[PDB]
Symmetry: C2
Subunit: 132 residues, 2 copies
């Protein structure tokens, strides 16, 4: 609705079909902040990862999940704002039944890039999402 779909996200960092559109790439480092828009098709999600800088998600459409490692998953819908603290290992993605669209803001980009870990397994995903 607000933005066109971006380009297909790498299978190295995503499970399923995800489209990413860079809004602010901050190539010159002026803002120390990057901004992206992402569409997760049903079932699609990031791998587990963390950022040294805090991340902010703003949900613009659909239904999805955010989960920090060892913690219960949080249900996302339009309007929700997720503050992802620095270094917290987490994933986010769509509900099984419905796409998720959100803006993402990476803060304190200079602290370093995302650290990518393992995929969110089918088991982890079902456990987090089944019947919610």
């Amino acid at each position: 609705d607000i933005f066109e779909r971006g380009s297909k996200g790498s299978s190295d960092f995503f499970t399923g079909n995800v489209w990413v559109k860079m809004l602010v790439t901050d190539e010159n480092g002026v803002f120390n902040t990057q901004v992206y828009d992402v569409v997760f098709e049903p079932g699609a999600r990031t791998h587990w990862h963390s950022h040294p800088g805090g991340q902010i998600l703003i949900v613009t459409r659909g239904k999805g999940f955010y989960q920090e490692r060892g913690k219960p998953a949080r249900i996302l819908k339009k309007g929700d704002v997720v503050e992802i603290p620095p270094n917290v290992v987490h994933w986010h993605g769509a509900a099984p039944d419905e796409e998720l669209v959100h803006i993402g803001i990476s803060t304190q980009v200079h602290l370093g890039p995302a650290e990518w870990l393992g995929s969110v397994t089918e088991e982890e995903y079902r456990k987090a999402t089944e019947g919610k």
Copy 2:
């Protein structure tokens, strides 16, 4: 705190001309992010005063029609989907079109570099010249 309001808290005449509603999305009370995020509605004709942010600002337009102008430069027309990169210390205003509202997300970057510096109102002549017939 701003969740208590229907449209947000009404913009103070100290900083805005006309009717504006602001909802803070990220206040960063605890400085975890060095960034603040807000959602703003400008009714037609409403706009910020001239101001600058030491750390810069990013606008993401979600609805309607507005204008962005840097001191001494031609105004830029804003529509849904537009992204405005406002560099550190650049003096500017933004706001709605004369006959349509503007809604946008604002991101104040590098907050630790200081608060916004607020200058004069955008005069009716400045606004008319910026917007009339556009």
